[PDB]
Design a protein around this ligand. Structure first.
Ligand SMILES: *[C@@H]1O[C@H](CO)[C@@H](O)[C@H](O)[C@H]1NC(C)=O
Lengths: 40, 50
């Protein structure tokens, strides 16, 4: 993580009204089997 | 056409109202549900888009 200060712009507001308790990220895989580049 | 009422923000409705703006006069105003009273003037401040 780099140093310095930077504010965060609000982007999206959604009136969904549901319950959220657990989550998981999603990636993209491509076959050349499949190879994935560096990411952090 | 049937209308439903549930535990939700309920943002389904048509036009509220519209009017012309007059400057340099003392008057009441209501912007987006925010009420106030005063005199309106051209503003040189540069607000952020949000
Ligand atoms: C999430 O909150 C709502 C509102 O009280 C509730 O009805 C629902 O059961 C909750 N979800 C879970 C998994 O408990």
């Amino acid at each position: 993580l780099p140093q310095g200060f930077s504010a965060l712009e609000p982007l999206v507001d959604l009136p969904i009204g549901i319950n959220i308790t657990r989550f998981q990220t999603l990636l993209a895989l491509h076959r050349s089997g499949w190879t994935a580049g560096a990411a952090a | 056409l049937s209308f439903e009422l549930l535990h939700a923000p309920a943002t389904v409705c048509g036009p509220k109202k519209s009017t012309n703006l007059v400057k340099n006069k003392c008057v009441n105003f209501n912007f987006n549900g925010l009420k106030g009273t005063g005199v309106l003037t051209e503003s040189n401040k540069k607000f952020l888009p949000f």
